[PDB]
Amino acid sequence: TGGRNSIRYSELAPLFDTTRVYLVDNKSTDVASLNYQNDHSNFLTTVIQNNDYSPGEASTQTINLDDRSHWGGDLKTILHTNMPNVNEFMFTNKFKARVMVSRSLTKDKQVELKYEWVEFTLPEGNYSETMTIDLMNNAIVEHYLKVGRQNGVLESDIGVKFDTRNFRLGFDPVTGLVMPGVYTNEAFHPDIILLPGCGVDFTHSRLSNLLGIRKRQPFQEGFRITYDDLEGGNIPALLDVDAYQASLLKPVIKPLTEDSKKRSYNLISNDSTFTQYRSWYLAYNYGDPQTGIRSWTLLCTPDVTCGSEQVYWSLPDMMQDPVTFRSTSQISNFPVVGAELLPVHSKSFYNDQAVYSQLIRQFTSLTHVFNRFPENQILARPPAPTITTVSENVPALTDHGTLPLRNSIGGVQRVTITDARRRTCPYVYKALGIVSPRVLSSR
Amino acid sequence: TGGRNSIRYSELAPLFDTTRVYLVDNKSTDVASLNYQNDHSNFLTTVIQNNDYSPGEASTQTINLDDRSHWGGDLKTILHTNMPNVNEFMFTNKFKARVMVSRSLTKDKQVELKYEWVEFTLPEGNYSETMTIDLMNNAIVEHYLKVGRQNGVLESDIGVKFDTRNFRLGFDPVTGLVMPGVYTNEAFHPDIILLPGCGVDFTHSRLSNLLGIRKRQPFQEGFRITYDDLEGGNIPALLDVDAYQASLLKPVIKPLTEDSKKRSYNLISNDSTFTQYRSWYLAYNYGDPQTGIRSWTLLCTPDVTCGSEQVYWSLPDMMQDPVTFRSTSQISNFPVVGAELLPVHSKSFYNDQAVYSQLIRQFTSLTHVFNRFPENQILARPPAPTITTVSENVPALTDHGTLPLRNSIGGVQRVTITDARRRTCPYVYKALGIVSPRVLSSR
Amino acid sequence: TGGRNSIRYSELAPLFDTTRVYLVDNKSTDVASLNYQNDHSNFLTTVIQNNDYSPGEASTQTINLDDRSHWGGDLKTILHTNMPNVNEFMFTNKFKARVMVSRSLTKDKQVELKYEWVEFTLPEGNYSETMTIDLMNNAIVEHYLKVGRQNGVLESDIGVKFDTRNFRLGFDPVTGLVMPGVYTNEAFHPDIILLPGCGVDFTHSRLSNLLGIRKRQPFQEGFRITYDDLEGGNIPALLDVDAYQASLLKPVIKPLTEDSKKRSYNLISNDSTFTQYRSWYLAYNYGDPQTGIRSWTLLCTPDVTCGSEQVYWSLPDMMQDPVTFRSTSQISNFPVVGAELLPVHSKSFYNDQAVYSQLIRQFTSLTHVFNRFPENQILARPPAPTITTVSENVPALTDHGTLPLRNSIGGVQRVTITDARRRTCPYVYKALGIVSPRVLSSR
Amino acid sequence: TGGRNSIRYSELAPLFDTTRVYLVDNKSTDVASLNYQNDHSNFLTTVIQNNDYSPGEASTQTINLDDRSHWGGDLKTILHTNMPNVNEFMFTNKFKARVMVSRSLTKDKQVELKYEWVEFTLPEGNYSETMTIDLMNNAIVEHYLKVGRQNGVLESDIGVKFDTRNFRLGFDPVTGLVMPGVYTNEAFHPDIILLPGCGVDFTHSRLSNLLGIRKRQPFQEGFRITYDDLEGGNIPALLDVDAYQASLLKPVIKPLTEDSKKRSYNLISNDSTFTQYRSWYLAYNYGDPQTGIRSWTLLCTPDVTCGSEQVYWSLPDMMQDPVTFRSTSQISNFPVVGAELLPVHSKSFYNDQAVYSQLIRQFTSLTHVFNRFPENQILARPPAPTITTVSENVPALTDHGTLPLRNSIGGVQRVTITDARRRTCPYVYKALGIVSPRVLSSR
């Protein structure tokens, strides 16, 4: 320690024992000269914070930690993002699903309905755990409006629909039917996937996390759930309110075959006490726990963030690249000095006006856009949850610890916030660096 | 320190004094090759973060900390879960209770009513301190609808019911009765257990914690509370509003024998100023503090989490297994390097619309599903609390400290987040590891 | 350091330099064998985490830190409680006060009214800063209903009442009276104590903290406040609304002698512009700041916790008992290794529906139980505050630092969370311990 | 280190290397004997935590750190206060301002109105950022009711009034007037000061911070703002709604000279499109940025705390009094060992029922006490902000670091939490101390 601990600049002053180097994006001089066509998750800083020098010719000068003992440096970072929820880079703007396109051209008198897989798109910015559902449901429907009805497909033949409510709620075991003729419009958190003949696919989406459905073995590439897979679910049929309560020697056993503005419920047969609409939530809970989707998958809470993936710092013109890491110039394989978690968490709130979520649309815009089928008790406006989560960005200010330090530091350091696939994150508005060099050995 | 502190990789570079090794689940290469049928609470990582190598043949290479001094490593971990409240692994989906099945087949003119213990089931996902009550109460009732009424059992003979309100509130000491003829519908936190002739059992449930009832000596395996145990409680009888207020030399002494839609209150006798419905809350508070259930148990606040049990890290192809720990290959007895708390806490909110919790059901769905008996002032819809708690998952980012380190580290480390019974937790979506090796001795 | 740093187990392995010992309550084996009749704030743990041993015969084995250098151990603890607000152990369930019992038997034509001190009781569980007031007020009244009215005492003779509002608000200095004939029903935080002829006493209560009234010199045992002490307060009289507004040469000077359902305001005389009802808040603020209760006491914010008292860890079969501490076997004098704060804080919220706190009772239950006197503007339902605080339990996870360590550690450590009077806290559901032994000297 | 590190008590035991000393207020024995007439921000503790000793004769005994090496001690403290917002010690209960007393006795027919400075007083407890305004405004008015009207002063001659809203909002540049005849009743945060002929003075108040108005050079003793200083503000005149909208060639140019219940707006002349009422907010924003109050002062956010001043620990019978500090016995100059921030922060909330803040008073009490002039659009009830802040007390638990330690420690330490003027803070209900002595040198 007491030997050579010198930290010499240019023709300035020896300051022996530990000092500060600063990795700053905001440097008024350099912003123009370098970083012109660079962001905040990939940039160059002048670490010669000397006023009297050309930020070009600053590169010439060396920091020079003493080359008699091995230096280390304590690294602190201040990172901040403005990343939303649903996004391009995050694969949270897109999801795939199967819908019907053709409704039975009736070739030689017989019903031949076709199906197809399509990639729905979302409009980035938005971020509610509730309304992110409604948005997908809108773009299942904005598809029907573009192709479905135009080639014959009925409104009662919708297909993929993300609801949130417990369907087998209200069900009576002897009736085979839901007793108060309306599915209990109270949200039950992991939003179901409802399907007849078709299905979804989050095989390249993180939105499956927003829904709170996850593969029980999730390193297995390929997450697709279909109508064949949802077996055991099968949302029970309603019950004609009026064909018992306004009648009545008992006519109990009457399912609500159609609805208000004449929308068929596609009941299996006239005998059946079930509809052909199938529910993930009921299959995960009320289906066979060993044969079907409870073995396949897992009931998790909705993650409004969709991954909470880590970012990694690379400081590779300063720090001694750690063990095993290639010393490279590929911006995609830069040695990692430290790894933060990407600074976004879920902040949950309460709101009982989820009951008057209905009294949202009525004075909102009277549009019913997230509500094309208010009369139908399936394809309906999904209820809202009691607790809404919003992906909130927050300042992360974390100590990466003490890293080994090279003893000749260019006045032009490169700072890089890579992601979990070592690509730049373009939502990093503010990255920062404080390094504190200090002794460790001899030679 | 200044002697041999070498950290040598393969045919790469000696980096002497402290560096970083990374335990990452997200590694793009290995996710396919290994971990295919593994989760995040049990996995293998390539700790050779070298690009140019076969993730199979990476296993060959050694990290090699110098074998001249004993190394240690500072361990930091970033753990995140998506675990809900009520759950399968957590034993929060099931509870046992006693209900009546048979109502008096009347063998040779005499009332012979039978009882049985049964295991009610919950639908995992959901998580409110209020609605988690309502859900159990629903599945006490969904049972009656399956067996009870069908073999004779009356609606006035319900049995196990979890309400939340102070019953002896409103009570007048000379009347022997509740004066304004309605039990004061304001929630008083630990939700009672109400019973005649029957009882509950949380002997294999953590839901007893949700209720905020706990054994005063809780290591004693076996938590069951019954009607015999609740002695002293005995919710006082109401008071016929109209047989005093519309009456009139005073007819005060009239209990409300039945209710609105003719539901008997099972009063002990016509003499008695009490009902046969018994309350835990009244027994814990107003019963004999030494004879009954105040000595047996404890009034705690509701824990929406139901345990806050710890998890444990095991890093056993890296860390020197601590004192006493067997060096094993049983995935269930892997040496523990560190112990976090399982990352879920209670976030409480306020809502005065618990008063208009009634005005929840009326515009919710008009279903009254959590309210089959709105007229009856016992078996009624329980009130909601003023402060509702929700089990919120949160990122845990904690320093486990500096652990001893083996000096030859395979490029294939195994990371394992075991639980309080050393079994894998399948709610761990993101586990992470940063290790910082540093010197400690010589030989 | 480099000499003898050996940490030897049984016939296992020397792991030289620092390792982990774990103090766990959850250990599956020992929960049965030991701790059977023990809680979480007093227990025994097997610190031999070896699978292959009898948890009885584990006691035999020694941890054995090297007896050549003095060891220390870094101690981390994870503590969690389920303690409510109002409680038995916390002395927050009970308070004393003086009420009248006898209203003038009129021995030889003359009004002789008697008084007595009594101990009111609360029903543990509950915890609001507002409703905790209402509950005491209820049990001032539940007393009147048991003895007061029965031996003659009028409703207009209530006595001890905890309101929250500024009384001298609305007062006009020339009228001697409150101008809009209603005391301004907006809460002003430290809830007053209102009294004629009687008083309160929190001499063995922490509830005086909930009220936000504190002795200015609070180590002086004995906190009782009486009508004689509250001098200068004297809530001003109202004003007969109708005997000015429906009148009119001005009749201004008419106090509201009685109220709606004929309840006297006990005005000093017909001359007096004051009532005999006295207010702590007015005395603390508007009385003589040197002669009365502003010198006696202090206006603090309500503490919904009632003390935030510290707990203490005692690890006495492991840690070297610190300086001065007796080496004992009295579970009440066990040496302290560390002291946390008992893990409960106040979480405050906002609610403007404190205005419609009136519209709470009307759709709550229409009971008016915390409101027996809605017409009377003194004994009335107190208003609610704008900011309500609730005693929330939270996980405490704190570093107690590095303590001296005995070098022969029994496989049967005793962990004890004592309180500020060294007695066990029976609200501790989860206690935990992580110890990291490391070197300090030689001999 | 390895030499003499002995820590010897009495006739007890040598515990060599680091241990714990505890500074506790709660000690059952001493609370009676000493501290009887002392608080928690100034007390004596027995640091001999030995049971078997007279707390008097404990003073005799010495802790005795070894006098061969210089000791230090790591100091941790747990501090908690119950300090409100508006207060006596904090100078947040008082403020000075100028009002008129005399309205023109008209000596020889001519209007001679007098003015005077007075010290308004607040009732300590209360603490809202909104209602703390309303309270001052009340005590501007409670003054008028005591002296103003009685010596002639009109209600339209009020003077000092603290509103919150943007006045020049609604203003049309060609009309010279506010177009919808009502000043836009939406709060705009730093509450103005409104004045004609008079002014305020926070020269000994921290309430100027609550208002969010601050001297741009604030070390300059003396903060007084007057009508002469507010030049350029001059809230524009309204507009007679009916003398344009109900009249059909345009009568636009009619100011609302009086109001509803005949209250003059004191317009400069009949010509003028401004009123004589002047606004700080408009002067700070719309006046000359160089000539007037924008140069004088600064627009800051409201601090509900009013200062966030620091407290200081003094441990002067233990710690070696730091550099420069006099070794004294004046309780007002005790050496400082550490400095915390006084544990109170602002917790902000949202409430849109600030719009129905009007529908607060109507069902509150119908008192209009903070609203004597509801018809008048200046002297009116100020609007509420969307975000209300409340001064919340919180437990502070902070590491003051490692301080030098005297090697002979009396069993009677004195703990003192001084303020920013080295006087005791009598809001400190719980102070605590953990010290960990450890070696530093030799002699």
UniProtKB/Swiss-Prot annotation, chains A, B, C, D:
MF-aspect GO terms: structural molecule activity
Entry-linked Pfam families: Adeno_Penton_B
CC per GO annotation: host cell nucleus; T=25 icosahedral viral capsid
Coiled coil: none
Record carries keyword GTP-binding: no
Compartment annotation: Virion; Host nucleus
Key words, A-Z: Capsid protein, Clathrin-mediated endocytosis of virus by host, Host nucleus, Host-virus interaction, Late protein, Phosphoprotein, T=25 icosahedral capsid protein, Viral attachment to host cell, Viral penetration into host cytoplasm, Virion, Virus endocytosis by host, Virus entry into host cell
Phosphoserine PTM positions: 329
One Gene Ontology term from the biological process aspect of the record: virion attachment to host cell
Record Gene3D superfamilies: adenovirus 2 penton base, domain 2, Penton protein, domain 1
Principal cellular location given in the protein's record: virion
Family: Belongs to the adenoviridae penton family.
Domain notes: The cell attachment RGD motif is exposed at the virion surface and is involved in binding to the integrin heterodimer ITGAV-ITGB5.
Assembly and oligomerization: Interacts with the fiber protein (via N-terminal tail region). Interacts with the capsid vertex protein; this interaction binds the penton base to neighboring peripentonal hexons. Interacts (via the cell attachment site RGD) with host heterodimer ITGAV-ITGB5; this interaction promotes virus internalization. Interacts with host WWP1 and WWP2.
Stated role: Major capsid protein that self-associates to form penton base pentamers, each in the shape of a pentagon, situated at the 12 vertices of the pseudo T=25 capsid. Involved in virus secondary attachment to host cell after initial attachment by the fiber protein. Binds host integrin heterodimer ITGAV-ITGB5 (alphaV-beta5) thereby triggering clathrin-mediated endocytosis of virions. Mediates initial virus attachment to CXADR-negative cells. Binding to integrins ITGAV-ITGB5 also seems to induce macropinocytosis uptake of the virus.
Other comments on record: All late proteins expressed from the major late promoter are produced by alternative splicing and alternative polyadenylation of the same gene giving rise to non-overlapping ORFs. A leader sequence is present in the N-terminus of all these mRNAs and is recognized by the viral shutoff protein to provide expression although conventional translation via ribosome scanning from the cap has been shut off in the host cell.
HAMAP family found in the cross-reference section: ADV_CAPSP
Stated name of the protein: Penton protein
Upper taxonomic lineage: Viruses, Varidnaviria, Bamfordvirae, Preplasmiviricota, Tectiliviricetes
